[PDB]
């Protein structure tokens, strides 16, 4: 298993820029072509929510064009910036397991050594996350049924506070429900999130829990300052690899940079 | 607790550049001034190994000058590129807990809600890591006496393979001795490493285990390809914060980038 | 009093770029977000003319939306690139004190220790500036009424030759009439202008007279060469502050640059 | 008269970078080559103090090499980071008009329509400026003898506070003495200063008073915050030109940027577009 | 004679970017203004094919506007990404000497010491080049009538393989027909081509044969790897100059870069340094 | 045959920069590592003169270390900036085929399908090129020796004027002697030169004649202007490849740039 995992694309409508000046559409199209050009090719691409910025049909038309040009199987989940019904309308042909109920989108993938669980933590009319009873029951059923096989969950909102003054108030509101699932099921070992536009990682019992950077604009972590900052610090994605019994995640830069070159001992330490 | 954690500085001697072209001395002096300018100031700065590139006295002269200009308490550990005896000579006044035995450098910090354990996984004559009997014994004693107080270990070499073709052959060779300690001591929940010049994270039982990017040059993760690449993809460090019961780590960019600006809902979704 | 003073925005219609390649609309949206994000917030933003590039209705639609997203009271005046009627129609709601006569747009502001006088020096069918009889009488009356209260005038066109080969022929054609006002009224101590896309400054009796850089492209100063050049040298604005009895202007960069860091005596001069 | 005017070069010793990471020596060598390559060549180059960073003889060796490669007559004055004796020992050959007394370095230039007065406002032991009695007396003598001929003063420290929280406490401490000269002598119409690493301008009676950007690093203007910031925002110099009866100053970017191109009416307002 | 020669502009529809992220329309607008701003002004500009990306009418609307804004006579030829009928409809008014037959667009220019020959090697339904009987027969007639006077051919597709694994399979399929004319006619001493988005040159008998860089995106030369790579490595055009008896071609960067400065002996080899 | 061909490296002594601000030493060390990292490995690397800037011993020290770290056989020739005796002393161990006479450095290589002839056109006391009686006699002998086997000459100075106002006066002054050999010997079909810091190409009879870009700073071609300009427009090398009967040269960028990506029909022309 190799997954390429990106988040928070924030597509805008045709010929608009984010905030009038960040060309998210072009930036994301570069990202798509970079993923398409990888020498070690992913088995699939994950996009963990906030696919569009404003929930508009015209933004989804751009998302479908750019995401649909990815040359991989896609696993897509909504964020709070998404509109559930439009997300299904425009993206279900790119991820057929999202199904037909805008309010119960979720799916499991059993192709690999670890089970993958994709859920919707977004809730209409708020930035905060919410896990419904049906999502929780479905999770319990999948973890129960999976038995001994490890599982990873992908969701938009972090299920616990991370100390980030901007982002904490809008985390997953009843995230304790999912934390109760990591207590009950030892096989649940990864929870990966979007929303925070930052690589922020913590550990609860046996599960590693981590947010991801955005594909374009980032949000700095502040512990006290609640001013709503964003910036254009370097974007990246996370690569997830099955390595024996270990699930290993590593950061892959989406910036254009100098190199690579080859290490040579004579060049490293000249005489 | 707020820690700024940087790694793999690879200082060169005065007026020399890494590989003849990467100005590590200047990039590191920038980094130092960046850390000195932080608005939310860390309590301490960790540097997790490969302080110098060639283990030369004249490189430690530079390292002492630049690291010596950080306005913070420092916790310094060696890597495989370091010379243990010069490390003590030139850096012990900056981290006095390193003591006077070049072959037994380690120390524990009890100032915070989580215990900090700093060790030397480096071995002379090899790039591979090695945990000595003295080190493993000291670790067991710390963890036994710590009781239910959480513990974090900082070491140069990762204690398990991560699937990185370049890096796995030179991980910590007897790292299973540390994995045995994670098994035995549930309070051991974080292990942070240098060496890989990449943010690569995994989980073993209750312990989150992660390598850090370098402060200057980076090493791409490859699964198959053994060619020894390095590049100038974006540099960063890790900030570690105690957030109630959770240790939270987040990535802090050391690049110069555009912004911050302030999110405004009108600008975000114009009419 | 703190004023942020920008000039010569040259907005184009939606999705268009200046000369087909300079993204003025994006650059200006970035500027507006910079101004909104200032820690020391100005009391008002001045925009001294050439708001649009071609005087077209769709350019004004973009200007109204982008300038309308500034979180400040605005003072707007036209330049030669503007169209007076459309300027009034689209922009007057953002600056109502201009009145409702497109041919006599001007205003006095008395909120601060120094009186602010905003006038229209643009003339239909020409790049040249022109001061109407009405504007001059209004100016004389304002300056009589004001007595020993200091006054600053903002206008598009500079009142006198500056030796700039490209710009001098298209300065204020009857600028002598404003210079006459400077001789007669010791209270008139500042004249700030757009048009030249350059920080150019001179003194006539008690008055400091300065043109401003543009927000995007700049015009180099050449003494002999009349080739009509432009460039993308760095953009800035002037901040104007009342410091006791002094009106102080300082340049504020609108470029994205490395820093800031903190000065440290021992880093500056190491031993 | 055309003058190129740069300030606060802050040269470091050979093979040293400012703060360990800003290559001030390389940046200044680029600036010198930029000034040498100008199509419209200045009559002289002014450098208004803080020529070196630490007052060290090794920094003066570098300053002398780099400023000595300028293909122009130089007018140099010190700043607080300069050491008076070393400044004269190393730089007097580049600007012999300053004399041979390190405590009284100044000169007047009468070649042009406006008289140019260069003074040392620096004072040993402090960052603050200070006008000595001999400087003040020399100034009064020049201004008296100049009569109706306009005059421009170049000095390191600004002679009045400008609202800059970091820089104001270290302005010219007896600046009021020079402001009294502005009142007395109507032909004194320009005072140009370094020190602030910022283009900050104001007017006091008939005199325009402006500080300059540095050639490398800059200092942001902050009204309340005393935190000693600096940054690498774009560097520039000031060009000063006599245009008829007007002294005109314009900013000349020292950054490397795209262009120039030529304006074309058809390209500006295309018949195809909204 | 001075010609500025650009190639492979790949214009897109108004508001569209190439592959969604390369702003070819803006990049080409910058290039046009760069050409308009040249101090040493060319006598004409050559554009050697792949004018639009997808052969669509909306792309030709953009090409016509931007190429239309060049302040020079234009010599335009198609590439495989062009549609011949639309190319003629939209661009013939910019290069009327092509004629009125979309299937037989070529022209010869006799203004200079060397004859210029512009031909269309593109063929509908394929990326490969193809020299038609009409084209070869007209080339022969031009070369034969030309007698002594040297000749230069401008065509989209290279007429021989160049060892480029990506590009060779889509060269001029019957390029041998043009190599046969090189053999027959010692007058024919240059053939310049687009298609490859690379400066690649070779020599066949008396003729120098060269492909050009693109104005925006480039294509790396690979000898074995057939992965279809492209990149944003530096763009440039070729300038062609008659220099007495020699035709001289030189690379002109279209990138925005630092400089120029002026060389100085004192600065090149300082007396202070090793 | 694959040759990587660079030129005009202009090395300075350790710690020095060209003109005080162009870091030739780092730029060239970057180039050397780029060449070492090439996927399609050249058979050899040619460096066609002006190896050092000032002809000083400490410059040759830097050149020897940096060029010595190329993992390829080298063919090195001097330019006018080089000193013949010091060139031999420091660089002849890197290219022993040159011989042991400083005033007669040259060699012929028969390894490939095209013979390679390396000559010294530099002359003490001048920037102009000169072919000595010995050099010209040797070339004649070698062209007799090659018979119908093709030949390529590498030299520093171009043997004919190219209309470049700065460079023509200091071309190879008796270059006509080489043009005479082209006429006599039809297998001589390439002449490659340094000196001009420009890709400028022409054809004389059967011989293609081309100057190369430098590795760092470039010289613009001007027809009339003799002002001695240099700039930092993009650097490159030429790769020379034997392709059946054709010698093919192609430009290889030494800049760091975005990409590569993979072309995709549906991304190129969306529907
Ligand atoms: Co988001
Ligand atoms: Co969100
Ligand atoms: Co390391
Ligand atoms: Co290591
Ligand atoms: Co304007
Ligand atoms: Co105007
Ligand atoms: Co200073
Ligand atoms: Co100072
Ligand atoms: Co093409
Ligand atoms: Co083509
Ligand atoms: Co050279
Ligand atoms: Co040369």
UniProtKB/Swiss-Prot annotation, chains D, E:
It is an enzyme of class 3 (hydrolase). GO terms for molecular function: 3',5'-cyclic-AMP phosphodiesterase activity; glycerophosphodiester phosphodiesterase activity; metal ion binding. SUPFAM superfamilies: Metallo-dependent phosphatases (SSF56300). It catalyses: a sn-glycero-3-phosphodiester + H2O = an alcohol + sn-glycerol 3-phosphate + H(+); sn-glycero-3-phosphoethanolamine + H2O = ethanolamine + sn-glycerol 3-phosphate + H(+). The keyword Ribosomal protein does not apply. GO terms for biological process: glycerol metabolic process. Binds 2 Fe(2+) ions per subunit. Active in the presence of various divalent cations such as Fe(2+), Zn(2+), Cd(2+), Co(2+) and Mn(2+). Fe(2+) is probably the native metal ion. The keyword Metal-binding applies. Keywords: Glycerol metabolism, Hydrolase, Iron, Metal-binding. Induction: Induced under phosphate-limiting conditions. The active site contains a binuclear metal center, with a fully occupied alpha-metal ion site, and partially occupied beta-metal ion site. The presence of substrate promotes the formation of a catalytically competent binuclear center by significantly enhancing the binding affinity of one of the metal ions in the active site. Fe cation 1 binds at residues 8, 10, 50, 197. It comes from the Bacteria. Its cofactor is Fe(2+); Zn(2+); Co(2+); Cd(2+). Its EC number is 3.1.4.46. PANTHER family: CYCLIC NUCLEOTIDE PHOSPHODIESTERASE CBUA0032-RELATED, PHOSPHOHYDROLASE. Diester bonds are cleaved in two separate (non-processive) reactions, indicating that GpdQ may regenerate its active site after the first hydrolysis. The metal ion-bridging hydroxide molecule activates a terminally bound hydroxide nucleophile. Catalyzes the hydrolysis of the 3'-5' phosphodiester bond of glycerophosphodiesters such as glycerophosphorylethanolamine (GPE), a typical phospholipid metabolite which is probably the natural substrate of the enzyme. In addition, exhibits a broad substrate specificity and can catalyze the hydrolysis of various phosphomonoesters, diesters, triesters and phosphothiolates. Preferentially hydrolyzes the phosphate diesters over the phosphonate monoesters. Belongs to the cyclic nucleotide phosphodiesterase class-III family. Homohexamer. Trimer of dimers. Tends to form a dimer under crystallization conditions. This is Glycerophosphodiester phosphodiesterase GpdQ.
């Amino acid at each position: 298993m190799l997954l390429a995992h990106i988040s928070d694309t924030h597509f805008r409508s045709r010929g608009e820029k984010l905030y009038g000046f960040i060309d998210v559409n072009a930036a994301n199209a570069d990202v798509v072509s970079q993923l398409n050009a990888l020498r070690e090719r992913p088995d699939a691409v994950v996009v963990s929510g906030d696919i569009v910025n404003c929930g508009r049909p015209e933004e989804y038309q751009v998302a479908r064009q750019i995401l649909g040009s990815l040359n991989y199987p896609l696993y897509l989940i909504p964020g709070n910036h998404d509109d559930k019904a439009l997300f299904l309308e425009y993206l279900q042909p790119l991820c057929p397991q999202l199904g037909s109920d805008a309010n119960n989108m979720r799916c499991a993938v059993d192709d690999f050594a670890t089970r993958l669980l994709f859920i919707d933590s977004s809730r209409a009319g708020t930035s905060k996350g919410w896990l419904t009873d049906e999502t929780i029951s479905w999770l319990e059923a999948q973890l129960f049924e999976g038995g001994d096989k490890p599982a990873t969950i992908f969701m938009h909102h972090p299920p616990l506070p991370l100390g980030n003054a901007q982002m904490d108030p809008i985390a997953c509101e009843n995230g304790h429900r999912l934390l109760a699932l990591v207590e009950r099921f030892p096989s649940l070992t990864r929870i990966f999130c979007g929303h925070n536009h930052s690589l922020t990682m913590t550990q609860y019992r046996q599960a590693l829990i981590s947010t991801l950077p955005g594909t374009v604009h980032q949000v700095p972590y502040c512990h006290a300052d609640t001013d709503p900052y964003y910036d254009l610090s370097p974007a990246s994605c996370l690569m997830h690899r099955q390595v024996g019994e270990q699930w290993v995640s590593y950061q892959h830069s989406l910036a254009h940079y100098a190199g690579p070159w080859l290490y040579d001992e004579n060049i490293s330490c000249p005489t």
